[PDB]
Amino acid sequence: ALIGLMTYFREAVVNTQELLDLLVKCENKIQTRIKIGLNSKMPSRFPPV
Amino acid sequence: TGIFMHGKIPTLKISLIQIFRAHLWQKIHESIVMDLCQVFDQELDALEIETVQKETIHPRKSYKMNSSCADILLFASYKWNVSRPSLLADSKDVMDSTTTQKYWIDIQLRWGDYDSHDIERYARAKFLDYTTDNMSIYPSPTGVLIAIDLAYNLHSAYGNWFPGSKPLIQQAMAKIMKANPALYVLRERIRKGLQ
Amino acid sequence: GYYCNVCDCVVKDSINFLDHINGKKHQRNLGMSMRVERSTLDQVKKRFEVNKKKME
Amino acid sequence: KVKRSRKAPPDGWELIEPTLDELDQKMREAETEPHEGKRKVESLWPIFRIHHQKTRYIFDLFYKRKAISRELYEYCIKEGYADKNLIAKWKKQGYENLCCLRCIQTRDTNFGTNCICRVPKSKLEVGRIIECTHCGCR
Amino acid sequence: MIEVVCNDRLGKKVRVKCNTDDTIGDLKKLIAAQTGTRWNKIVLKKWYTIFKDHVSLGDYEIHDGMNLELYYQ
Amino acid sequence: NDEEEYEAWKVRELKRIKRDREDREALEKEKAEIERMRNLTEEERRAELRANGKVITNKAVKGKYKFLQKYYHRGAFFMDEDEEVYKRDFSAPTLEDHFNKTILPKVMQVKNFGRSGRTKYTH
Amino acid sequence: MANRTVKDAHSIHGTNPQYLVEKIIRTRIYESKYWKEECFGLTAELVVDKAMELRFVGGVYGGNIKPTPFLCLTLKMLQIQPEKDIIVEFIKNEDFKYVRMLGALYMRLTGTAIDCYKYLEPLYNDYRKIKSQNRNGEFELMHVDEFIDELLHSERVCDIILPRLQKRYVLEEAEQ
RNA sequence: UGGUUUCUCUUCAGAUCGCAUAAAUCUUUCGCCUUUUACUAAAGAUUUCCGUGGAGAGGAACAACUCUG
RNA sequence: CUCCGAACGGUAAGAGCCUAGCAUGUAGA
């Protein structure tokens, strides 16, 4: 879903402050969503690796 | 089995049970104590050892993280001069210390994590904690905390050494951490679990 | 494990083997927990004299 | 004990100094008495008994003997030598040897009456050696 | 400098920042400065592993955020 | 060592008698220090004699938070012992303050779904 | 077995006589090897037998709270609660240096304020030495006058907290 | 005409009743959000608590000092 | 530039034996 959006909006996604705010909120939400499926204790600092 | 699981983690909790299915982790500690005793008995004449007389222990000794009793001890013959306490890699050892006659070696495996790969620092930490303020059954003058990390496959030791035992235990730990009959069963369980 | 004589049981702990002998159902009329203090001047001072005489 | 005023008490206080000190030392020794021996409310009985004798000494020196001055009388009631309510109940002719001020309270009894402390023996029953549990005596 | 969070039971959870080469005796003095007890009567524990009184924090590999279960002796 | 033990017992009892004598003299020295400081402000010197310094038990060595480092307090529970573990100048990046927090796009205060407070401390 | 060795004899200054030490120290001392061999039976004459055999003055030691027999005999004496004549007999007896030190701990904990200054004052003239278990378990030499002055010092004894009714200066204005 | 005080109990308070100022609830809003409570504060009105104001009732202290007129 | 968070979502699951800090204050003959 991201490769379909970033390639079609190659110059547009860099020159839109509201579009970058949606990406930083969604990517932090999915890393929150995938971490709950592993354990459900709300971890403090999950490793990005 | 001694594997510390921090969170709930319902996926990886059962997978560690599937690896440590039967009494295999306790059989690792029995295999290392038998393998190091066989290397000590094969060179007991030149090392001035009287009799390798490794006594029995509690069957859940490796499970208990608090106490650390003498597992594989070695009676020296006579005029045995102990050395300064150092790690298993410090080549600048000094034998200017007290002279004892009874000497032990306590092996304690520890399944480490990402923030516990300092197996050399962990070996001196477990020895100095279990030396004076231990409240555990151990002989007084000297010991050896020959630790073996199960996760990172790291081998390290710390404590007061014996003359001629520092190249002896280093050559024995290479044949104990590699090609062991228990560690080969451990590596076969992980590779079958991950395919 | 241990072996209780009067209680007729078998415990594994050291304090539990002592507690099964004294402090059980069979230990009701066999030295119960209700103790008694001795004389402060007669029985107490004679024990200090007997300890000094046996040592010296 | 601290006088808690530090305001230079007048003449006559030195005349009543060792007498009030002996009564204050008796109440402090009674307050340090353990709870053994007393059943449920018998331990509070020497607390009111030392307080009853402390109020009787000031009232006899002011009303009966009239030897203490009124300035030393007001300083004694303010420092805590005697309760002002206990001297007020003794001023009336109906009560001159009352046991305690708790026994004169009408709302204290469950039946809504006085205690056995404020009752004469001639108007009472024949066989009665009872003592007031709240007050302390008859 | 690691921020060890001595999080015991029943609300007693404080942050204690100590050096890596700092001994455990210096850590109990900093843990008592945020909790309100005598530092000689505090025994740190991690699944029945009572820590010593002479081993540095760099030997236990206690990194930043490694919380401890505090107990009182 | 019977004669040596009687000398040390006389040494400790003389210091204990000196400790009890200085204990009652501590109340006299407290009123004397109040009398000396009152005369020092009155008719000693008009801002020409201070005769003291800045004697504080624990050191006030501090630093500066980089951009969003947490307000880590030392804890106001033991301030009279003056131990060496306290004077350490707690202004170090502990866990998450090691980043510069300026290259980051708009703001990252706490990414743990609990940002009740909405502040940056400039107003 | 561990509540109180007397049913109803007396009471401590502010609580039960068994709850005079700290609850964290009393729970670890209740489960001990020296305690379980002693709490099954202990009398007045038996208290003089066990106290004379031990020569140590200290409290807890080690990682886990391991109580010394000096603190173990102090709790067994406080649970038994003997008479004041037996406690004065253990303080005046010169049969052992640890015997007078064991009576002084029971005097400063449960005794009165005037009785504590009256009994501990002749103990300050003793110049003998004793062995004390430190925090790391090693033995340390302590004089008899050093331990007696520590009981009259601030409340920092090994698992003991019981202030007096006043200091030595405030008691001097009232009595000797 | 005739009483300075103090403590109990009966109403309404539309006066900065409070020259100062807490919590909870309800109806709408924002931010985080991952289950929920503890959350952030903008609007309005409903309680609880910290308190108070005039006017009759009953006790105690010199009510007698004689207050205003 | 100094705005500092707490709990739940978490340790299992069972077999035989062993010991404990607790509570009520009755009418009746």
- Evaluate whether chains D and F are touching (3 or more beta carbon pairs less than 8 Å apart): no
Give the span between the Cα atoms of F70 and F95, in whole angstroms.
Answer: 10
Nucleotide nearest to F123 (CA to C1'): I1
Method: cryo-EM
On whether the CB atoms of residues B71 and B130 are closer than 8 A, the answer is no
Give the span between the Cα atoms of G15 and D68, in whole angstroms.
Answer: 45
Nucleotide nearest to C9 (CA to C1'): I17
Any G CB within 8 A of B133 CB: yes
Where are the extended beta strands (E) located within E1-73? 2-7, 13-18, 42-45, 69-72
CA of D128 to C1' of I14 (A): 68
CA of F69 to C1' of H38 (A): 25
Residues in chain B: 195
Breaks (C-N over 2.5 A) in chain G follow: none
- What residues of chain E lie within 8 A of the CB of F92, using their CB? 1, 17
What residues of chain B, 132 to 161, have a C-beta less than 8 Å from chain E? 133
Any G CB within 8 A of B140 CB: no
On whether the CB atoms of residues B104 and B144 are closer than 8 A, the answer is yes
Give the span between the Cα atoms of E51 and B122, in whole angstroms.
Answer: 13
H or E element that contains B160: strand B158-160
Residues contacting B37, CB < 8 A, separation 6+ = B52, B54, B72
Question: E45: how many CB neighbours lie within 10 A of its CB?
Answer: 17
- What residues of chain C lie within 8 A of the CB of G36, using their CB? 14-15, 18-19
Give the structural domain span for B3.
1-195
Residues contacting G51, CB < 8 A, separation 6+ = G73, G90, G96, G98, G99, G102
**Residue B130 Cα, gap to closest chain E Cα (Å):** 9
Q: How far is CA A16 from the centre of its chain?
A: 16
Give DSSP secondary structure letters for F18-54.
Answer: HHHHHHHHHHHHHHHHHHHHHHHHHHT-SSS------
Give the span between the Cα atoms of G3 and G25, in whole angstroms.
Answer: 15
Residue from the list F95, F96, F105 with its beta carbon closest to the beta carbon of A24: F105
Q: Count of C–G CB contacts within 8 Å? A: 69
> Tokens for F47?
């801002």
Any A CB within 8 A of F113 CB: yes
How many domains does the structure of chain B reveal? 1
H or E element that contains B124: helix B119-129
Asked if residue A28 keeps its beta carbon closer than 7 A to nucleic acid strand H, the reply is: yes
CATH for B162: 3.90.1570.40
Beta carbons of G149 and F12 less than 8 Å apart = yes
Give the span between the Cα atoms of D39 and F45, in whole angstroms.
Answer: 70
- Evaluate whether chains G and F are touching (3 or more beta carbon pairs less than 8 Å apart): yes
User: For tokens 């003089």, what's the residue?
Assistant: G48
